[PDB]
Amino acid sequence: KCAIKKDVTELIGNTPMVYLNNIAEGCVARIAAKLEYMQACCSVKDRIALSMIEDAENKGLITPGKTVLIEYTSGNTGIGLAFIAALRGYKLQVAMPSYVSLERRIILRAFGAEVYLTDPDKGIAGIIEKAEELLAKAADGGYIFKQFENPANPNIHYETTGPEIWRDSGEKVDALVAGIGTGGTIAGAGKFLKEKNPDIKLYGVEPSESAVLNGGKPGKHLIQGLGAGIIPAVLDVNILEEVVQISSEEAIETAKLLALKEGLLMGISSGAAAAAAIKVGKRPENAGKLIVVIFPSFGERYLSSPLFESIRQEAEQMTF
Amino acid sequence: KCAIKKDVTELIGNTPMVYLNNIAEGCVARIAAKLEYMQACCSVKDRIALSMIEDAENKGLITPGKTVLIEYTSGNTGIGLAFIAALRGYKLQVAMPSYVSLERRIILRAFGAEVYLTDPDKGIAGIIEKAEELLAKAADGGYIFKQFENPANPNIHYETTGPEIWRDSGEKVDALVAGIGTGGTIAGAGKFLKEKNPDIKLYGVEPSESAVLNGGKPGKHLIQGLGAGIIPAVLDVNILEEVVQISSEEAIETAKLLALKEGLLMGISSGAAAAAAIKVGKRPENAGKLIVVIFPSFGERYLSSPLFESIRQEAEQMTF
Ligand SMILES: [Cl-]
Ligand SMILES: [Cl-]
Ligand code: NA
Ligand code: NA
């Protein structure tokens, strides 16, 4: 009884950290990775799905069996909303670009969510437009979560992710490295950490092919979860020390090294974040410091992605 | 520093339990599920991969960069060995039936393991034969782990899984329900629990189409992870109260209900174990008792399985 969780929502957050060892050869800082796949549905977005649903409930803006929940998503936020909507009795509709993997669409449908695909050429505008169309058709009321502007997104990282890093690092964390998608993680956890110790430095990560935070133009890239092509409303770029640019190729190669050297089967965005943390960790000014890097998800969620393309081809041609 | 794990092997075990709620409507016992996907590579077998490797190391039977590690597996034990072999510098070869999913073969190759497929018509005999062939070809020595007879398999569940259940249940657990594959989980955890409280009852689960523990003949079934068609050497059937028989169909339907009612995307063998626990939990003699049920893995590992067949067909036919 005494440690048994009430339901799946009590399995969100409280994720562990692990040192990076052989992959960090040459670093003069120590690097610890926070493993966001170790929770209810195996990604960081589980935190914001619960936070945004609870916020809407506290305001009476969603009611089970009445309100249609709606979100625009590339997959992980939709999945986070979907398992909680199933548990709590909400109808859920997600708008997603048609390039999202079949695997993530299967997971959404297994939780009973409805999937509406959009034209990839219309970008973020396309999925926001579809979410607005769905809201207009909701006969008994709907609610769009809007994770790029909803304060419950950074706020949950201020309330949980940041405090976990501070406590679990023994208050010794010197820097946070985090890829920026919505920017909620680095905005909320970083705000908390700098309140605890204003010397802590925050490093964003973005694709070098879509380096909008550094003033570049949007462009196509492979780092799923990063590079939305916009500066999200929930992110204040002024608190950042730097936004490190990582190529799709470098992110994929570093993800492969996480599996082969650390035994960690991680996704492309974790590869990008690790590559950035290792670069920062080689700088002489960081000698003896502790760098914490966010790993947002698990590699098993991305087996149809370019991360595994050449392996997939080999395994298809094998027999007994 | 103070809670940061040394490496991925310190992320094995110590998994949480969660109450089952709406899916257990009608039960007069309370049911708590132990979530073995919440660890390093998301299955119960991570425990025995580390235990069997450490045992061989303690005996000097495997040496990194010299010994070829070999195991016969249907996937999860191979994956557990593979991430530790990658971390520690061991070459690993696995023998598997050719029906194992492409997804699990991709994961094995991403960790650098070599995959040797066998004829499914030769059953367990086929994969043991291939492992013996590989051992004969190992020029500098090899080692076959033999999870069906290796005592390090049940012993780790005596040392970790059982103690976790006892402690996390506040010493109130009255019964353990666990599917039997190698039988290591129920043998080791059950042995520990009955030492703590000899009134605790142990319920195995097996497929009704391959009910060998109940005296039936082996047969084809869909409950991946259960129903090896043999009685493994590491299992003493005499400690069991009962082996509950669950059909492939019932296991799949219950797995679907775990996702839709509990928000838990679980695999077919977790569906079978939950179905058995819910049946036992409806018996009047168990009124007021606490039943713990083992959930061995996560449903995302099985998206190409019959559990998702009809959803997969729907999602393939969708456009923007
Ligand atoms: Cl293969
Ligand atoms: Cl779809
Ligand atoms: Na302060
Ligand atoms: Na005793």
Author numbering:
A (entry chain A), B (entry chain A): 4 to 323
From the paper:
The nutritionally essential sulfur amino acids, methionine and cysteine, are present at suboptimal levels in legumes, such as common bean (Phaseolus vulgaris L.). β-Substituted alanine synthase 4;1 (BSAS4;1) is the major isoform of cytosolic cysteine synthase present in the developing seeds of common bean. Cysteine synthase is a member of the pyridoxal 5′-phosphate (PLP)-dependent β-substituted alanine synthase (BSAS) family. The enzyme catalyzes a β-replacement, exchanging the acetyl moiety of the activated form of serine, O-acetyl-L-serine (OAS), for sulfide, producing L-cysteine. BSAS4;1, a cytosolic cysteine synthase, was identified as the likely enzyme involved in the formation of free S-methylcysteine through the condensation of OAS and methanethiol.
The crystal structure of PvBSAS4;1 was solved in the P41212 space group, with one protein chain in the asymmetric unit. The biological assembly of PvBSAS4;1 is a homodimer, in which the 2 subunits are related by a crystallographic 2-fold axis, and cling to each other using their N- and C-termini. The positively charged active site of the present PvBSAS4;1 structure contains the PLP prosthetic group and a molecule of benzoic acid. PLP is stabilized by a covalent bond to Lys48, creating an internal aldimine. The benzoate (BEZ) molecule is located ∼3.7 Å away from the PLP ring, with its carboxylic end facing the protein core and the phenyl ring pointing toward the entrance to the active site. Its carboxylate interacts with the backbone amides of Ser77 (3.0 Å), Asn79 (3.1 Å), and Thr80 (2.9 Å), as well as with the side chains of Thr76 (2.5 Å), Thr80 (3.0 Å), and Gln150 (3.0 Å). The phenyl ring is stabilized by hydrophobic interactions with the backbone of Gly184 (3.8 Å), and side chains of Phe151 (3.7 Å) and Thr185 (3.9 Å), which create a ligand-binding cavity. The structure of PvBSAS4;1 includes a few more accidental ligands, attracted from the crystallization buffer, such as 2 molecules of glycerol, a sodium cation, and a chloride anion, all bound on the enzyme surface. Although we did not obtain the desired substrate complex of PvBSAS4;1, we found a distinct patch of electron density corresponding to benzoic acid, bound in the active site in a position usually occupied by the OAS substrate. Kinetic analysis indicated that benzoic acid acts as a competitive inhibitor of BSAS4;1 with respect to O-acetylserine.
